[PDB]
Amino acid sequence: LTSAQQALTGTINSSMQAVQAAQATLDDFETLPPLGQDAASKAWRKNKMDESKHEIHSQVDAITAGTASVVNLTAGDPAETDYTAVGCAVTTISSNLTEMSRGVKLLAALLEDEGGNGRPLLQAAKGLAGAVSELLRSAQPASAEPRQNLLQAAGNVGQASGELLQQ
Ligand SMILES: [Pt+2]
Ligand SMILES: [Pt+2]
């Protein structure tokens, strides 16, 4: 039975949709533009891989911190929780996950394109995206807890982000 915990349930619902979408986008690379062995082509591939590696670290970082905010904001006996604040933090997580996915598709694309292999990247991105969802599942005001469930979820985010960063 809920209050303006219902306001939170909606945000979680909206962010879960966003996550499941990002999660679907991670089955494949972006189609690259027509490149070849043109020198230019080469600077383009390179410049994009850098920015993409950077942008991704930035977004994962914002992921682990949002997760940490979710855990801290959701602890301490409900009936005191700032539900709107929890809401804003899960918005930070999901919003970032969306952008992380675009980045990783491009980067996996670039690895793959040049003899590398991007599947693991894509896989590990999927990995992070699914742990993100397990977390939003547990942060749902209607959960019959128990607290440990939410903690193990916050800890899986971090573990998947970890593996993700090893590219
Ligand atoms: Pt859901
Ligand atoms: Pt690269």
Side-chain angles (χ1 to χ4, degrees), residues 1-15 17-48 50-167:
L1 140 70
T2 85
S3 71
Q5 305 185 304
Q6 42 205 192
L8 200 233
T9 300
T11 298
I12 295 156
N13 289 158
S14 178
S15 302
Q17 168 145 173
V19 172
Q20 298 252 30
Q23 189 175 13
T25 234
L26 291 147
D27 302 309
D28 208 22
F29 320 119
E30 205 177 356
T31 93
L32 291 164
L35 297 174
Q37 212 46 47
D38 179 321
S41 287
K42 271 314 201 159
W44 196 93
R45 289 206 207 65
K46 207 227 50 63
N47 158 324
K48 270 331 154 191
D50 285 343
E51 244 177 88
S52 271
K53 268 156 131 3
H54 151 31
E55 295 166 28
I56 298 188
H57 267 102
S58 208
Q59 299 142 162
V60 167
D61 285 352
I63 293 155
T64 57
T67 294
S69 253
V70 166
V71 172
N72 152 273
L73 229 37
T74 157
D77 151 23
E80 259 142 302
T81 284
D82 189 333
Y83 289 101
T84 115
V86 177
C88 256
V90 337
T91 296
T92 304
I93 294 163
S94 66
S95 193
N96 272 278
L97 225 269
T98 296
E99 309 286 334
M100 189 211 66
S101 297
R102 312 210 246 248
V104 149
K105 324 241 282 163
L106 181 53
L107 186 56
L110 287 164
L111 298 190
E112 178 76 26
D113 189 56
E114 30 154 271
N117 179 32
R119 311 239 52 109
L121 190 50
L122 258 10
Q123 244 211 274
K126 249 252 194 160
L128 172 48
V132 165
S133 251
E134 197 25 69
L135 178 96
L136 282 322
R137 218 180 309 294
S138 73
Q140 202 90 252
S143 202
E145 304 297 76
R147 192 51 185 181
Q148 165 83 189
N149 173 61
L150 194 166
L151 268 11
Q152 188 180 90
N156 287 173
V157 175
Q159 174 64 29
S161 30
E163 296 165 40
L164 172 292
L165 264 20
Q166 276 194 76
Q167 267 79 5

